[PDB]
C-alpha cells in the first residue's frame, strides 16, 4: 500500500510542490555551510579592504535566508493543506461506509471499538501524513546535499569523514538498541511488586481484615529493592550511552581536524575547504539520523490506513445507497414468509430461523407468540430486511424484499422498539428524525394521539424540550410513547411493535394500545407482547414452534386449540506544592548530589571548552605567522579533542551512577513510603471511585519515573545548561562584548520561536481534539443506536449532520496549518539571518581592528552551539510539567492521612472481651452516597457465646452491621458498643486482630494454601499442627490431604484452582485460626455443594461454643438453629426473638419462611 493517499489530484500537485520545496530547503542547508567556508576562507586570507568582501557574503547569506524562509514555508504549509484535504475526505468517507455497513457487520465488530477507530486512527494517519513526510524528504534533500557538496569541495577528507560517520551511526543505535532492551527488563522485574501490590489492593478489605498489612508490605519492599537494582543498571545504561555519543562525536571532531591539518600545512586546499567539508558531512549524518521519525510516524500511518481502507473496501451484502431495485407506487397488504431459513451470523452454528410458513393479507392486525427465546421477534427483525434469509422466502405484496428499494421498502415499513432508543434531541428534532415531511402539524396531531403531552408540555419549550444524557429527561412510558409517536408520524404500510409498554409499567399501557390499535385498518400490525390482555385484543394470532408456526387462529381458535397460548393463558394468572519541600530526596541523595553537580558542572563547562579549544585550531591558522611549528601547534589542539571527549564521556559516565542511584533510591523509598501509606487508611479511602484499586496501583507503579525526574533530571539538566551557557557568555563578554552584545539580544528572538513553535503546536493539537469531540458526539449517537437508526433509514440525514459538524473546523485545520507553517518558516530562517547579520557585524569590527577574526569565530562558536546544546539537554530530560503534578499527587496521597489511624498504640485494649455488643440507633450513611442512608438506626443486642441471625433486606444493610462490626467505617449516629467498651476508643488493632469476621466472597492471595491458612493469624506464629486442626474444624484437612504437595501447593489466582466450596471452606478455617471471640459469617452457605454446605454449616455450629457468632444467610434452618434473630426493615429492627416466637407472629419472617 505504499500509495496510501488516492484524493484530489490538485492535492497532489500541492504535495509534489511541498516536496520540491522540501528538496531545496535541504539542499540550502549545506550550500549555507559552504558559503561559511568561503566567508572562513577570505577571512584567513585577510591575516596578512576585507568590509567589502565581508559585505557581500552577508549579501549571499541573506538571500539564501530568503530563499529558505519561503522554501520552509512552502513545505510545510503545502503539506499541511494537503493533509488537512485528504483527512478531510478520508473521514467523510470512513464515516458514509460505516453508516453504509450492513447489520450483521456491525453486531460482529465491537461498536465501541470502531467509534475508537474513527476518533483515532484517522488522527494518526493524520499526524504520520501531515508534516514528517515533508521533514522526511528534506532530512534526505540535506543528506545527499551535504555528501555531494562534501564530494565537490574535497575529495579525501570527505572519504575520511564519509568512512568515520556510519561508526559513529552504528554506535548510537546499538546503544538506543540496549537503552531498549534494559527498559524492557526493568518492566518485567517491577512486574512481581506490580503483581504483589495488585493482589494486595484487589483484597484491602480481607487484607485491612486480617491486618496483615505488614507481611505484604516487606514483600513489596524485597521486590521493589530488586526493581531498584534494575533501574539503576537501566539508567546507568542511559547515561553511558550518551557519554559514548559525545566521545564518538568529539574523536570524529578531533581525526577530522588532525587530518585537515596536515593537509592544508601540506599546502593542498585551504582551510576554509576544511571547514566547509568537515560541518557539510557531519551535518548530513546528523540529518540522516534524524530521518527516522517521519518513518516511524508513516509506518503506524500505513498500518491504521490499512485497517480504515480494508474497512472501507467491504462492500456490503445489502447497499442500502444502492437503488438497483423495484419500487412500487401503491402497497397492498401481503406479507408472505415461506420457509425462512437462518440463523444469527454471529454464530451460525445454531439455526433459529428453521424454517417458518406465514401468509398475511391486507387489513390484518396480525400478531405472533410463543416462550422467550423462539425467535418471535427474530421474525419481525428479519421483516425490515435487518439480516437475509439463508434459505427461505420473504415477500410483501407478492414480491421479493431483495428485489425492491431497501431504502424505500425499510422507510415504507415502521417498527416499535422494545427499548426504544431517542435520538438526543429535542422533541421536534426527534420528529424531523422520524420524517421531515411531517409538516409540524400531523406531528401535533400524532403527539396528542400518542398520550404523551403531559411531560411534554410541562417540559420547557413543550414542544422542543430537549432529552439530557441517555434520556433521563423523559419518562420511560414517555419514552415509548414518543417512539410510538414518532413511528406513526411516518404512516407506513406495516407497523411492527414489541413490548410496547412491557418495559416497566402498564398504566400508559392502556393509552398505548387504545392509540395504537385506533389506526391500524390501512396498516397491517405485527405485535409482541408479554400480557394477556395484549393477546386477547389479537385478530389473528400465530404460535411460535422452534422457528415454525404451529398454531394458526385467533383467540377463541387458540384457546380451543389448547396451544401454549392457552398454557400461559392459565399460568398468566490538582493541587500545587513547592519546589523546596518536593526535594526529599534530600535525606538520600544529599552526598549524591554534590558529585553528580560537580560532574555536571564540567560537563556543562565541556561543550563552551570545545569552542575556544575550536577557535583556537582556527586561530593558528588566521595568523599571518604561519611557520612548520603551527604543525606541532596543531597537535597541541588535536590531541586535545580526543582526551577533551574523554572528559566529556567520563563526568556523564559518573554522573549516570551517582544521580543514577539517586533517582534509583529515592523509586524504593518513596514507594516504600506510599504504599505503606495506602495500608494505613479507611476502607472508606479506598470507597471512593477515583482510587479505583487499578488507578491506586497504576499510580503506585507509574510514579518513579516522574518524581525521579521532577526532583533529579529537572535539576540536573538546569545546573546543565546553566553552567554551559553562562560560561558562554561569560566568554563571549571577556573576548568580545559587541558582537558578544548583538548575539545575546539576537539568541532570544530563537528562544521565542522555538517556544513559540512548540506551545502553538500543544494548543492546536487540544483544540482539534476539542472540536473532533464535538463531532464525535454526534457521530456516537448516529453508531451506538444503529439498529434504530436503519430501522428509521435517516443515515443519510446524519451523514448531513456529520459533514456540517466537519465543516466547521475544516477551515480551522487549514488557518492553523497555515499558522503553524509560517511559524515554522519564520524558526528556520532566524538562524540563517542571524548568521548573516553576526558575520557582517564581525568584519564591521576586525576591519576596524576591533576584535580577533579568532575572536569572532570563538564568540560566534561559543554561543551558538552553547543554545543549541542547552536545547537538546532540554529536550533529552523528561518533562518537568507532567512530573511535577505527579510528584504533588504522590505527595498528597503519602502525606494524606486516615480518620481512624489503625497504627495509633493509644486505645482501650482490655485484657479479655466479654463478648457482649449493643448496637443503637446506629444509622449508617455510605460515604458513596451520603444522601442516601443505608441504616436506620436499628436496635440490637447480643450476649457472651449469644449467636445471632439477620433477617435484613436486600441491599438496605442486612451485611453491613458485621461491616460497620468490622470497623471499616464509623457510626454516622447512634452507637454500638462491644463488652462495655468505647469502639472509638478501642484500639483498632485488638478490635480487628479480635474478631473473626467472614466475608461473602472471601478472597485468597495466589499463593501456598498454607500461607494463605497462616495469614489470618497475625502478631504470632501459627504451628502447621494449629494449622491442620484448623483445617480439620472446616472440613478442609482431608482434601488438602488428597490434594498433592498438601498445603504447599500453589492456590490458583483468586482459589480458582481449588472448588468455590474448598475456597469457602479454607476460608473458614482460616477465620477459625485467630480463635475469634466474636465471629461473623455472611451468605457463605447458598447451595454450595449442598452437601458440602450443610457439612461446612454443622462444623460451624460445632465449633459455635465459647463465641458469639453474627450470622447472614438464605436458608431457613440455619437462621432457625441461631440462638437468636434480629428483623431487618429498611435499617429498622422489627422484631427480635426465637424462630418459634418470629414465625407465629405475622412478622415478614414467617412469610420468608413460608417462601422456601
Ligand atoms: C541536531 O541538529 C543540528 C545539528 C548540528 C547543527 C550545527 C552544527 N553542529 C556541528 C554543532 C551542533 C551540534 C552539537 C555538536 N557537535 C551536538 C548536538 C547534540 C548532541 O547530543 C547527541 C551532542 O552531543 C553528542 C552534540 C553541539 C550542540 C555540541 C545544527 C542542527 O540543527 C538543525
Ligand atoms: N446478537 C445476537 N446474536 C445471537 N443471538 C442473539 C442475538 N440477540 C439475540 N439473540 C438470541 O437469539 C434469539 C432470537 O429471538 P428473538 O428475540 O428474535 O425472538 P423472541 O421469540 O421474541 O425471543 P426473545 O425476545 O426471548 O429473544 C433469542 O434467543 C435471543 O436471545
Ligand atoms: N462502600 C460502599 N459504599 C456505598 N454503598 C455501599 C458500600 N458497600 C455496600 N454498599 C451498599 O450497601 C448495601 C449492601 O449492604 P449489605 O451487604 O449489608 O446488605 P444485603 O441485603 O446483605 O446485600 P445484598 O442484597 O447486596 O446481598 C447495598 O446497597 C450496597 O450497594
Ligand atoms: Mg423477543
Ligand atoms: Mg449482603
Known amino acids: 500500500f505504499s500509495m496510501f493517499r488516492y484524493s484530489n489530484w490538485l492535492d497532489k500537485l500541492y504535495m509534489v510542490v511541498g516536496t520540491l520545496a522540501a528538496i531545496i530547503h535541504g539542499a540550502g542547508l549545506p550550500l549555507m555551510m559552504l558559503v561559511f567556508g568561503e566567508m572562513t576562507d577570505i577571512f584567513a586570507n585577510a591575516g596578512n579592504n576585507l568590509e567589502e568582501d565581508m559585505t557581500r557574503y552577508a549579501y549571499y547569506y541573506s538571500g539564501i535566508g530568503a530563499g529558505v524562509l519561503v522554501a520552509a514555508y512552502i513545505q510545510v504549509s503545502f503539506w499541511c493543506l494537503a493533509a488537512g484535504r485528504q483527512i478531510h475526505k478520508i473521514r467523510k468517507q470512513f464515516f458514509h461506509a460505516i453508516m453504509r455497513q450492513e447489520i450483521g457487520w456491525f453486531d460482529v465488530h465491537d461498536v465501541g471499538e470502531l467509534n475508537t477507530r474513527l476518533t483515532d486512527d484517522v488522527s494518526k494517519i493524520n499526524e504520520g501524513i501531515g508534516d514528517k513526510i515533508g521533514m522526511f524528504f528534506q532530512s534526505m534533500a540535506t543528506f545527499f546535499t551535504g555528501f555531494i557538496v562534501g564530494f565537490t569541495r574535497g575529495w579525501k577528507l570527505t572519504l575520511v569523514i564519509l568512512a568515520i560517520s556510519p561508526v559513529l551511526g552504528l554506535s548510537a543505535a546499538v546503544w ?23 493482589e494486595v489492593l484487589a483484597a484491602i478489605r480481607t487484607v485491612i481484615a486480617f491486618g496483615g498489612q505488614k507481611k505484604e508490605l516487606e514483600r513489596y519492599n524485597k521486590n521493589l529493592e530488586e526493581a531498584k537494582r534494575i533501574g539503576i543498571k537501566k539508567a546507568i545504561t542511559a547515561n553511558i550511552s550518551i557519554g559514548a555519543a559525545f566521545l564518538l562525536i568529539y574523536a570524529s571532531y578531533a581525526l577530522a581536524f588532525w587530518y585537515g591539518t596536515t593537509l592544508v600545512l601540506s599546502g593542498e586546499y585551504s582551510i576554509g575547504q576544511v571547514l566547509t567539508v568537515f560541518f557539510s558531512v557531519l551535518i548530513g549524518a546528523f540529518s540522516v539520523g534524524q530521518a527516522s521519525p517521519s518513518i516511524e510516524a508513516f509506518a503506524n500511518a500505513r498500518g491504521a490506513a490499512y485497517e480504515i481502507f480494508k474497512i472501507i473496501d467491504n462492500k456490503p451484502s ?158 420511560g412510558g414517555q419514552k415509548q410513547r414518543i417512539a410510538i409517536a414518532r413511528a406513526l408520524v411516518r404512516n407506513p404500510k406495516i407497523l411492527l411493535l414489541d413490548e410496547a409498554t412491557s418495559a416497566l409499567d402498564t398504566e400508559s399501557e392502556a393509552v398505548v394500545q387504545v392509540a395504537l390499535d385506533k389506526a391500524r385498518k390501512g396498516r397491517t400490525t405485527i405485535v409482541i407482547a408479554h400480557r394477556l390482555s395484549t393477546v386477547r385484543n389479537a385478530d389473528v394470532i400465530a404460535g411460535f414452534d422452534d422457528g415454525v408456526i404451529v398454531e394458526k387462529g385467533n383467540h377463541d381458535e387458540l384457546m380451543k386449540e389448547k396451544g401454549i397460548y392457552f398454557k400461559l393463558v392459565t399460568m398468566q394468572t490538582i493541587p500545587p506544592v513547592s519546589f523546596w519541600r518536593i526535594m526529599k530526596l534530600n535525606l538520600t541523595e544529599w552526598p549524591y548530589f554534590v558529585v553528580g553537580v560537580f560532574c555536571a558542572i564540567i560537563n556543562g563547562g565541556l561543550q563552551p571548552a570545545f569552542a575556544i579549544i575550536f577557535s583556537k585550531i582556527i586561530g593558528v591558522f588566521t595568523r599571518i605567522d604561519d611557520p612548520e611549528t603551527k604543525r606541532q601547534n596543531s597537535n597541541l589542539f588535536s590531541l586535545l579533542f580526543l582526551a577533551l571527549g574523554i572528559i566529556s564521556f567520563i563526568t556523564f559516565f559518573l554522573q549516570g551512577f551517582t544521580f543514577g542511584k539517586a533517582g534509583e533510591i529515592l523509586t524504593k523509598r518513596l514507594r516504600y513510603m506510599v504504599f505503606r501509606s495506602m495500608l494505613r487508611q479507611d476502607v472508606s479511602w479506598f470507597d471512593d471511585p477515583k482510587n479505583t484499586t487499578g488507578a491506586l496501583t497504576t499510580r503506585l507503579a507509574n510514579d518513579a519515573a516522574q518524581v525521579k525526574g521532577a526532583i533529579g533530571s529537572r535539576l540536573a539538566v538546569i545546573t546543565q545548561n546553566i553552567a554551559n551557557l553562562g560560561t558562554g557568555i561569560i566568554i563571549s563578554f571577556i573576548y568580545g562584548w559587541q558582537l558578544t552584545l548583538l548575539l545575546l539580544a539576537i539568541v532570544p528572538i530563537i528562544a521565542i520561536a522555538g517556544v513559540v513553535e512548540m506551545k502553538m503546536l500543544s494548543g492546536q493539537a487540544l483544540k482539534d481534539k476539542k472540536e473532533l469531540e464535538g463531532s464525535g458526539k454526534i457521530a456516537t449517537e448516529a453508531i451506538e443506536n444503529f439498529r434504530t437508526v436503519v430501522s428509521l433509514t435517516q443515515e443519510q440525514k446524519f451523514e448531513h449532520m456529520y459533514a456540517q459538524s466537519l465543516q466547521v473546523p475544516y477551515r480551522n485545520s487549514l488557518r492553523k496549518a497555515h499558522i503553524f507553517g509560517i511559524t515554522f518558516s519564520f524558526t528556520q530562517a532566524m538562524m540563517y539571518f542571524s548568521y548573516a547579520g553576526c558575520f557582517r557585524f564581525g568584519a564591521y569590527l576586525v576591519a576596524h581592528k576591533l576584535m580577533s577574526f579568532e575572536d569572532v569565530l570563538l564568540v560566534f562558536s561559543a554561543v551558538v552551539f552553547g543554545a543549541m546544546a542547552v536545547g537538546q539537554v532540554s529536550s533529552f530530560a523528561p518533562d518537568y510539567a507532567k512530573a511535577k503534578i505527579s510528584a504533588a499527587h504522590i505527595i498528597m496521597i503519602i502525606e494524606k492521612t486516615p480518620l481512624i489511624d489503625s497504627y495509633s498504640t493509644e486505645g482501650l485494649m482490655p485484657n479479655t472481651l466479654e463478648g457482649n455488643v449493643t448496637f443503637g440507633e446506629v444509622v449508617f450513611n455510605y460515604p458513596t452516597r451520603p444522601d442516601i442512608p443505608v441504616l436506620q438506626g436499628l436496635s440490637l443486642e447480643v450476649k457472651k457465646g449469644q449467636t445471632l441471625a439477620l433477617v435484613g433486606s436486600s441491599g438496605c444493610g442486612k ?37 473473626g469476621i467472614v466475608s461473602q466472597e472471601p478472597i485468597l492471595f495466589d499463593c501456598s494454601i498454607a500461607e494463605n491458612i497462616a495469614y489470618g493469624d497475625n502478631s504470632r506464629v501459627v504451628s502447621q499442627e494449629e494449622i491442620v486442626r484448623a483445617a480439620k474444624e472446616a472440613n478442609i484437612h482431608a482434601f488438602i490431604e488428597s490434594l498433592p504437595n498438601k498445603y504447599s501447593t500453589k492456590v490458583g489466582d483468586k482459589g480458582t484452582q481449588l472448588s468455590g466450596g474448598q475456597k469457602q471452606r479454607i476460608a473458614i478455617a482460616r477465620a477459625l485460626v485467630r480463635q475469634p471471640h466474636i465471629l461473623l459469617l455472611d451468605e457463605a452457605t447458598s447451595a454450595l455443594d449442598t452437601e458440602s454446605e450443610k457439612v461446612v454449616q454443622e462444623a460451624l455450629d460445632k465449633a459455635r461454643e465459647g463465641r458469639t457468632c453474627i450470622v447472614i444467610a438464605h ?21 427480635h426473638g426465637t424462630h418459634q416466637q418470629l414465625l407465629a407472629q405475622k412478622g415478614i419472617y414467617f412469610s420468608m419462611v413460608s417462601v422456601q
Open 176 to 198: 538506543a538498541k540496549i537503552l531498549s532492551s534494559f527498559t524492557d527488563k526493568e518492566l518485567l522485574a517491577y512486574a512481581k511488586a506490580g503483581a504483589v501490590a495488585e
Open 318 to 475: 445489502i447497499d442500502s445507497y444502492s437503488k438497483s431495485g423495484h419500487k412500487p407506487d401503491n402497497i397492498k397488504g401481503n406479507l408472505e414468509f415461506r420457509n425462512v431459513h437462518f440463523s444469527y451470523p454471529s454464530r451460525k452454528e445454531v439455526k433459529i430461523l428453521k424454517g417458518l410458513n406465514l401468509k398475511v393479507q391486507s387489513g390484518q392486525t396480525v400478531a405472533l407468540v410463543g416462550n422467550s427465546g423462539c425467535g418471535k421477534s427474530t421474525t419481525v427483525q428479519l421483516m425490515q430486511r435487518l439480516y437475509d434469509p439463508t434459505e427461505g422466502m420473504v415477500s410483501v405484496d407478492g414480491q421479493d424484499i431483495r428485489t425492491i428499494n431497501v431504502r424505500f421498502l425499510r422507510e415504507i415499513i415502521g417498527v416499535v422498539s422494545q427499548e426504544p432508543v431517542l435520538f438526543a434531541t429535542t422533541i421536534a428534532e426527534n420528529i424531523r428524525y422520524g420524517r421531515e415531511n411531517v409538516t409540524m402539524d400531523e406531528i401535533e396531531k400524532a403527539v396528542k394521539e400518542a398520550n404523551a403531552y403531559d411531560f411534554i408540555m410541562k417540559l420547557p419549550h413543550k414542544f422542543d424540550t430537549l432529552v439530557g444524557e441517555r434520556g433521563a429527561q423523559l419518562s
Open 959 to 995: 451485611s453491613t452491621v458485621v461491616q460497620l462490626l468490622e470497623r471499616f467505617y464509623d457510626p454516622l449516629a447512634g452507637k454500638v458498643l462491644l463488652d462495655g467498651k468505647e469502639i472509638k476508643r478501642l484500639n483498632v488493632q485488638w478490635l480487628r486482630a479480635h474478631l
Open 1115 to 1135: 436458608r431457613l434452618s440455619t437462621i432457625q438453629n441461631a440462638d437468636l434473630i434480629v428483623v431487618f426493615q429498611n435499617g429498622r429492627v422489627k422484631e
